[PDB]
Amino acid sequence: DIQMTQSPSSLSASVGDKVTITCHASQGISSWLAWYQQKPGKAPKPLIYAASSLQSGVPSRFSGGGSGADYTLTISSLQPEDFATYYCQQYDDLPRTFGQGTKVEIKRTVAAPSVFIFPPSDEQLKSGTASVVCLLNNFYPREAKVQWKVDNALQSGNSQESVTEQDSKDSTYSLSSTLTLSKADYEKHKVYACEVTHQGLSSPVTKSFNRG
Amino acid sequence: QVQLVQSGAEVKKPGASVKLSCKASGFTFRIYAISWVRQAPGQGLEWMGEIIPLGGITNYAQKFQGRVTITADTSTSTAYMELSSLRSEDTAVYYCARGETKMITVLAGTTGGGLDSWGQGTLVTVSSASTKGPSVFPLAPSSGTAALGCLVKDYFPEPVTVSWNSGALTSGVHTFPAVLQSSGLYSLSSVVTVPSSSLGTQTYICNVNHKPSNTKVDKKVEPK
Amino acid sequence: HINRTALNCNDSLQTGFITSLFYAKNVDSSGCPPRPCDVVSARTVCGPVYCFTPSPVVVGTTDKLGIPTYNWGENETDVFMLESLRWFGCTWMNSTGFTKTCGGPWITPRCLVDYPYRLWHYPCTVNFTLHKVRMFIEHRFDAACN
Ligand SMILES: *[C@@H]1O[C@H](CO)[C@@H](O[C@@H]2O[C@H](CO)[C@@H](O)[C@H](O)[C@H]2NC(C)=O)[C@H](O)[C@H]1NC(C)=O
Ligand SMILES: *[C@@H]1O[C@H](CO)[C@@H](O)[C@H](O)[C@H]1NC(C)=O
């Protein structure tokens, strides 16, 4: 088949900047190249076709260029609605193949996460399971490390994380870390701690509790 | 006009098959290639196959050549996509899209190439798990601003609606994406931040609604 | 302009010729080794009709008076008036997938005038080599020779 690789795979920009996404093909595709824009939860919106030609209804700040095996999408100056994921797709050969996508997210100043730890409810412990939750609220950039420490032993393989998309107004992220233990293992230890390292924290922030 | 309308969001078990439909309108059905593209959760777009209704011209990605069948039915202008021997890997959002053909790149002169029109998409979950309502546990605030929430654990399938004070509380709320636990069940947490000033005076209730199971749970979150 | 194309394509012999109408495909070169240009009924034609003036020119469907019709060549009064654009030759695909010709695109037994559907109508000319031809009023077109 024809492999399509985009570059970069993630990009952080603010409103009014010029952006160029690169799309590379493992063979020449004779400028039969399309670009789509997808926002999370919606179907992809057609953007560019035939490398340069503009799809119907899209603004003039979008444009594409290239030839042979290398193409480029350029946004004149970004607008708030333009932050999304962008895919290229060759239609010179079958199967049609897409590129991995490029996520254009909003740039902002560094913001530290407010860290919160929540003990497992007494109600859940009756069921035989303890879910300890750690909340990292409103921070930037996305990259954070949560590590769990029970009686000061570092946990591995018993936690799951979930992060929200960038907020509509403050452009920050939020993250939850859930440590899941059986009731039996939960009652063998007393100190449950959530240690957070982020670019906005001069020193790691730890939140913790004892059973009771 | 020119739109592709999609529906048939379905939950299936491993080994079964699913048949997705795509009603086309606003263009000459016979001439355009109705293609199918799927997106697994958090992943990229994957082209599966295309049908050109006139000649019944079908072409599939080789990975799906022994599981997918795409059909035309030029009478009602409705493209269908049947995928069988369903796998957990087939959990995805399936899109219907209109693609141009060589008859349009030539002797048309009306612009618009590629896949220039898309359906809404229908979500298809493949799992061996059984429908179950969620257990809602509280994330009680701690001993000048505070945070509280609800742990909506162990439900199937997606989705689950969460709201605070029956919709009155919306500022500072974050409902996180659901995570698929190794049990086969999903779990989710929703949080909100509040002035610790009004912690005992104001009352906070999360409204969890899982209608796949006809379940609605509202639980008040209070300290201690 | 699109409605002026004959779409009477029924592959009753099951040769799969219709796929190369919509996709360039890979010409199947293995298996490869005198009418005047009148009027052609449209219901016998599948896909575009190309006459060569020698320059390649698409002929759209018309009625028996030359009025453009836009019925995809479905009514019996739809025709292709080939004798209205006069070396001159035309070609098209009939409904069961055979290449019809009148006099085709062959300027010589060796060379053939190139056009977007050359390899559909003549799958055995794929390994031919193309090059620009200028000749007088001047015609800008490309030819495919051995
Ligand atoms: C399309 O063209 C082919 C080629 O001429 C037609 O097939 C011929 O049919 C006659 C019918 O008596 C035979 O005698 C010839 O031997 C056939 N030719 C070949 C090469 O097989 C076909 O009938 C045409 N179809 C339509 C619908 O017009
Ligand atoms: C062309 O074909 C379409 C397809 O049925 C039809 O709706 C339309 O009326 C035809 N004529 C014109 C002028 O578009």
Q: Which residues of B touch C1 (CB under 8 A)?
A: 107-110
SS3 (DSSP) at A107: coil
B187 and chain A in contact, CB less than 8 A:
yes
Sign for the CA dihedral angle at B162, B165, B168, B171 comes to: negative
**CB B147 within 8 Å of CB B193:** yes
C-alpha of residue B210 to centroid of ligand 1, in Å: 64
Residues A90 and A144 occupy one common structural domain: no
Residues 6+ apart with CB under 8 A from A39: A45, A84, A85
Cα A167 from Cα B170, distance rounded (Å) = 13
Q: Which residues of B touch A124 (CB under 8 A)?
A: 135, 137, 151, 153
β-bridge partners, C106: C112
Residues A192 and A122 occupy one common structural domain: yes
Q: Which residues of B touch C58 (CB under 8 A)?
A: 107
Q: What are all long-range contacts of C80-83, with beta carbons under 8 Å and residues at least 24 apart?
A: C80/C6, C80/C39, C80/C40, C80/C41, C80/C42, C80/C45, C80/C49, C81/C39, C82/C37, C82/C38, C82/C39, C82/C40, C82/C49, C82/C51, C83/C36, C83/C37, C83/C38, C83/C39
| Residue whose tokens read 């029970």 | A150
Number of domains in chain C: 1
Residues A123 and A191 occupy one common structural domain: yes
Query: Which of the ligands is closest to the CA of residue C35?
Result: 1
Interface test with B, best of A118, A137, A181, A194 (most B CBs within 10 A): A118
**From the CB of residue B216, how many other CB atoms can be counted at a distance below 10 Å?**
12
β-bridge partners, A135: A116, A176
Cβ–Cβ below 8 Å for C22 and B106: no
Residues A99 and A182 occupy one common structural domain: no
C116 and chain B in contact, CB less than 8 A:
yes
**DSSP secondary structure string, chain B?**
--EEEEE--EEE-TT--EEEEEEEESS-TTTSEEEEEEE-TTS--EEEEEEETTTTEEEE-GGGTTTEEEE--TTTTEEEEEE-S--GGG-EEEEEEEE--HHHHTTT-----SEEEE---EEEEE-S---BPPEEEEEPPP--EEEEEEEEEEEBSS--EEEEGGGTB-TTEEEPPPEE-TTS-EEEEEEEEEESTTSSSS-EEEEEEEGGGTEEEEEEE---
Residues A152 and A61 occupy one common structural domain: no
Residues 160-199 of A with CB under 8 A from B: 160-164, 174-176, 178, 180
Residues A99 and A118 occupy one common structural domain: no
Atom of ligand 1 nearest to the CA of C100: 2
Query: Which of the ligands is closest to the CA of residue C12?
Result: 1
C-alpha of residue B106 to centroid of ligand 1, in Å: 28
- The H-or-E segment that residue C121 falls in is helix C118-121
- Round to the nearest angstrom and report the end-to-end CA distance of chain A: 60
Neighbouring chains to A with at least 3 Cβ pairs closer than 8 Å: B
Residue A127 is given by DSSP the state T
Q: Which of A69, A88, A106 marks a domain boundary?
A: A106
> Smallest CA–CA separation between C30 and chain B, in Å?
22
Q: Tell me the resolution in Å.
A: 2.6
Q: Which of A106, A126, A152 marks a domain boundary?
A: A106
Cβ–Cβ below 8 Å for B45 and A101: yes
Residues A55 and A89 occupy one common structural domain: yes
Q: Which of A53, A85, A106 marks a domain boundary?
A: A106
Q: What are phi and psi of C110, to 5 degrees?
A: -100, -30
**CB A38 within 8 Å of CB A87:** yes
**CB A25 within 8 Å of CB A70:** yes
Cβ–Cβ below 8 Å for B31 and C19: no
Cα A179 from Cα B148, distance rounded (Å) = 17
Sign for the CA dihedral angle at B211, B212, B213, B214 comes to: positive
B74 and chain C in contact, CB less than 8 A:
no
Q: Which residues of A touch B50 (CB under 8 A)?
A: 96
β-bridge partners, C57: C51
How many Cα atoms within 13 Å fall on the side-chain side of residue B26?
8
Cα C36 from Cα C39, distance rounded (Å) = 9
Cβ–Cβ below 8 Å for C19 and B55: yes
Tell me which chain B residue has its CA closest to the CA of residue C14: B55
Cβ–Cβ below 8 Å for B44 and A135: no
Does residue C15's CB lie within 6 angstroms of at least one atom of ligand 2?
Answer: no
Query: Which of the ligands is closest to the CA of residue C11?
Result: 1
Q: Supply the range of the domain harboring residue A197.
A: 114-210
> Smallest CA–CA separation between B120 and chain C, in Å?
26
C-alpha C102: how far from chain center: 10
Cα B153 from Cα B206, distance rounded (Å) = 13
Tell me which chain A residue has its CA closest to the CA of residue B6: A43
Nearest to A82 by CA among A38, A44, A20: A38
Q: What are all long-range contacts of B43-47, with beta carbons under 8 Å and residues at least 24 apart?
A: B43/B92, B44/A87, B44/A98, B44/A99, B44/A100, B44/A101, B45/A36, B45/A38, B45/A44, B45/A87, B45/A89, B45/A98, B45/A101, B45/B95, B46/A98, B46/B92, B47/A89, B47/A95, B47/A96, B47/A97, B47/A98
Closest residue to C22, CB basis, from B33, B107, B109: B33
Nearest CA to ligand 2 atom 6: B28
Nearest to A71 by CA among A38, A102, A103, A116: A102
Residues A101 and A123 occupy one common structural domain: no
Cα C106 from Cα C121, distance rounded (Å) = 12
Residues A20 and A81 occupy one common structural domain: yes
Cβ–Cβ below 8 Å for B113 and A123: no
Residues A89 and A69 occupy one common structural domain: yes
Residues A63 and A135 occupy one common structural domain: no
Atom of ligand 2 nearest to the CA of C2: 1
- Round to the nearest angstrom and report the end-to-end CA distance of chain B: 58
Number of domains in chain A: 2
Domains contained in chain B, CATH given: 3-126 (2.60.40.10), 135-221 (2.60.40.10)
Nearest to A75 by CA among A25, A121, A117, A15: A15
| One-letter-per-residue 3-state SS of C65-101 | CCCECCCCCCCCCCEEEHHHCCCCEEEEEECCCCEEE
Q: Which two tokens stand for residue C27?
A: 């010409």
Q: What is the CATH number of the domain that holds A42?
A: 2.60.40.10
Does residue C70's CB lie within 6 angstroms of at least one atom of ligand 2?
Answer: yes
Atom of ligand 1 nearest to the CA of C95: 27
**CB A131 within 8 Å of CB A178:** yes
SS3 (DSSP) at C15: coil
Residues A14 and A70 occupy one common structural domain: yes
Tell me which chain C residue has its CA closest to the CA of residue B101: C22
Residues 58-117 of A with CB under 8 A from B: 87, 89, 91, 94-101, 114, 116-117
Cβ–Cβ below 8 Å for B176 and A50: no
Q: Is B56 left (phi over 0), alpha (psi -120 to 50) or beta?
A: left
Residues 64-123 of B with CB under 8 A from A: 95, 99-100, 111-121
Residue C106 is given by DSSP the state B
C5 and chain B in contact, CB less than 8 A:
yes
SS3 (DSSP) at C125: helix
Does residue C68's CB lie within 6 angstroms of at least one atom of ligand 2?
Answer: no
